[PDB]
Amino acid sequence: AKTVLRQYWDIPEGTECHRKTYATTSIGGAAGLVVSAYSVALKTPTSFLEGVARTGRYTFTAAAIGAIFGLTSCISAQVREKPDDPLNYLIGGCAGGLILGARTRSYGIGAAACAYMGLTAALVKMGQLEGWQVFAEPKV
């Protein structure tokens, strides 16, 4: 997981959109596969085909979110000429949230997902700019 995140953060914002969209789509796909694996192990599918359908459903749903976020956030930075801006990630985060509403066919989930995922992406950008640590190395 550290190799993809290294590739994504190496590219400058607002440039090389296709490369950016690939890193986030692959990241989204991985999360989808992880969710599918636990889902299939802890909630046995009725048949082999039902298990494959569920895995594809979750995995595509997660890659769809990862693709839209990467693409939308990279275009926003390009169009606005604002690379180091959290607002681009907020736009990209909300777009991914709407997809979840569509894939889950709902309006409340889409609205809730847009706000929560939109804020989360913006916070991620701020932490990158300001060097916020999630898993901080012990220092004292």
Ligand X SMILES: CCCCCCCCCCCCO[C@@H]1O[C@H](CO)[C@@H](O[C@H]2O[C@H](CO)[C@@H](O)[C@H](O)[C@H]2O)[C@H](O)[C@H]1O
Binding site for ligand 3PE (CB under 6 A): 34-35, 38-39, 42-43, 130-132
What phi, psi does 135 have (nearest 5°)? -100, 90
The answer to whether 134 contacts ligand X (rule: CB under 6 A) is yes
Q: What angle do CA 26, 47, 37 make, to 5 degrees?
A: 30
**Vertex 24 angle, CA 22 and 28, to 5°:** 115
Q: Does 112 bind another protein (CB under 8 A)?
A: yes
We find the least distance from the C-beta atom of residue 127 to another protein, in angstroms, to be 7
Q: Is 106 left (phi over 0), alpha (psi -120 to 50) or beta?
A: beta
Distance CA 103, CA 9 (A): 28
**Residue 138 binding: pick among ligand X, another protein, ligand 3PE, none (C-beta 5-8 Å cut-off by kind):** another protein
Fill in the amino acid letter for 91.
I
CB nearer another protein, residue 56 or residue 127? 127
Give least dist CB 91 to another protein, A: 17
Pick the closer one to ligand X by CB: 51 or 109: 109
- Residues near ligand X (CB under 6 A) are 6, 9-10, 119-120, 123-124, 127-128, 131-132, 134
